[PDB]
Design a protein around this ligand. Sequence first.
Ligand SMILES: [Cl-]
Ligand SMILES: [Cl-]
Ligand SMILES: [Cl-]
Ligand SMILES: [Cl-]
Lengths: 306, 306
Amino acid sequence: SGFRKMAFPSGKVEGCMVQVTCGTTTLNGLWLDDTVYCPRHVICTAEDMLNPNYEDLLIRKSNHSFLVQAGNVQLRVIGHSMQNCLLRLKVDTSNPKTPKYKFVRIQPGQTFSVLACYNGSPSGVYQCAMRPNHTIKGSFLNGSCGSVGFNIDYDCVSFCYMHHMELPTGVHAGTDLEGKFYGPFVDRQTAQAAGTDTTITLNVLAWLYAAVINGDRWFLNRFTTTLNDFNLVAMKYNYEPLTQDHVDILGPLSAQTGIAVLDMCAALKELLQNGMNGRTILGSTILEDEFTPFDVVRQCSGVTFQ
Amino acid sequence: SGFRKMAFPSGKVEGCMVQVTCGTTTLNGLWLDDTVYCPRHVICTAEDMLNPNYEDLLIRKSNHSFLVQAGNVQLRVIGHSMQNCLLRLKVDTSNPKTPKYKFVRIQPGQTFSVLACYNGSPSGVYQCAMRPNHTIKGSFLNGSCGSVGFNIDYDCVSFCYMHHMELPTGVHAGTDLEGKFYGPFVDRQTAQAAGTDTTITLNVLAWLYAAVINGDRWFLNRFTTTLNDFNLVAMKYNYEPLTQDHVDILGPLSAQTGIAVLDMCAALKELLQNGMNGRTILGSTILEDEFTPFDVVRQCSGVTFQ
Ligand SMILES: [Cl-]
Ligand SMILES: [Cl-]
Ligand SMILES: [Cl-]
Ligand SMILES: [Cl-]
């Protein structure tokens, strides 16, 4: 029993983290096989992030311009190239702790664990979700660029986020490990701002199933709703519309609990309309949307507290 | 910027985890140097947890009775002994990934990260706090006994919790790594129940400093209070009394923010009296007590958003 935000154990990725320095800028890189990934803004200067041209900024340096430090061991760079917003520095050494791995572009709504690192050294790990507005509410201080996000399936580490920027409201924007940003963001110091966000409906619904699998029934009700009626209510409270694809995703949890999705929808629309007055769900006052249906199945029992 | 519950990276401890099996019971053990620690209830039978005598249950077996599995590698046990509620099985092999480490008995109020494991294999990590009633609201399913809790200082891993039991309300009880339970709990299937808990006042206060270091001031007020007046209010809302030792602990955060502790106390007593109407603090509606003053200093800036 219990239900907590939980991250994937972080060891396989800790053994991937190095420090890349260029000039006076130091940040984190990920080191898999003979290659180290890091944010290309590592070459941008003492503020010429105001208007960088990177194709040009990068042609002004060589291999010996980047130093990569794995613990107390200098990696020699012997070639480098730019891939969208990331650099990829070839080193003379293959990392011998490279886990089996993949790079995946994750989708709004999905969750992943972030190992926050400073100067190449891991310092804490925490779970979050890609928001619908393509930011993440991380916790990052100066020096954490290049910190990665990942999920782990079996023994395979699926990298999906590398950290690049903080936005004016304090939320964070970065890219996948091909160097393509999540969201309309660019690696330049511009006026740019997270857009309006929305609550991940599929997630809240998964977390109500989690509260019933764990053994709580109190918000349920004898009603059902159509998708259409549900969404007209969702949209008013700034929830993402629910589609039949999300309805289908919740199939397994619904079958484990004997509650129809649309009956779960009625119950939420109630929680939306009547507030959570005074009561909590899995410990929260507030509908929580940073758990996916898969996180709830991973973490919950396979048997329902009926 | 940002503020999240965060756990310590878990790698140094992942390389400590093994599987111990005895008869039909399989659970997790921690493997440091030539020794593996695990809950002595690993020898208790298909329910004779109802009234175990362990001195007696253990004298009925030998070394070859326990099998310890590190990945796909059987550890031979070559001696074993009981230390309060834990067994300590000597193996023919020193773990070669033993980190620098210490065992510490942690105190109510303090926090630590838990690596949850099944059959010896890590599956997720999350942060929590020792409650004042000596339980922890973990998230643990069948098979997670022997999962450890730890903090990490520098490169030294300070182990402080090994998981043993779940209690009737769904919270969790276990021991330090000397085998002494936290709380009045015993490793027997008894009627025993977590007692009443209280909110960790020092923690909530640290987390208000965190909301001002991050840049939020809205709950502050022009009042101050004595300790005494504060506690008469605390006790009514079921907060632990605040003492001058806790007041002193908050010295550094108070100096970083220019807010007197007792002025912060006034502000909380207000939040207690007037509710948080409608507003959030660092994202929470609800005063959060699972961050210590040290977690807030580790995670926050050294410079205040003034
Ligand atoms: Cl681009
Ligand atoms: Cl940042
Ligand atoms: Cl005892
Ligand atoms: Cl348990």
